[PDB]
From Swiss-Prot:
This is Gastrotropin. Changing residue 77 to M: Probable risk factor for type 2 diabetes obese individuals. Induction: Isoform 1 is up-regulated by chenodeoxycholic acid (CDCA) via the FXR transcription pathway. Isoform 2 is up-regulated by NF-kappa-B and in all stages of colorectal adenocarcinoma. Isoform 1 is not up-regulated in all stages of colorectal adenocarcinoma. GO terms for biological process: fatty acid transport; lipid metabolic process; negative regulation of cell population proliferation. It comes from Homo sapiens (Human). One of its GO terms (cellular component) is cytosol. Keywords: Acetylation, Cytoplasm, Lipid transport, Lipid-binding, Membrane, Transport.
Amino acid sequence: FTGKFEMESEKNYDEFMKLLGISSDVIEKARNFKIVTEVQQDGQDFTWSQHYSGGHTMTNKFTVGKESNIQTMGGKTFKATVQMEGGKLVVNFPNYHQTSEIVGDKLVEVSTIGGVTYERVSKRL
């Protein structure tokens, strides 16, 4: 997982963002942000950073198997426990499922809420 990754692809961004309840005007603007993810893994400990066009940053620090609270790029916090399952980091929370995986030097992140699945693929820098 350790690396710096730049988003190159995403599936179902609009459908996912509407479900979060964010305005169409903000969806349209936010769609054009470049997202760079920087990850540092030290054993069980992760530091996980998202850097957005403009220089805003969101950092989460968690231990696999420990309860933690995660915040999102905008700033919405939630309690969760990250599990290592088959190569994936997996997170759960009321009505929300999230995975992060390295697939052939790419970082692939999947979030599912109900029938809606968002995917992000980020190339390694």
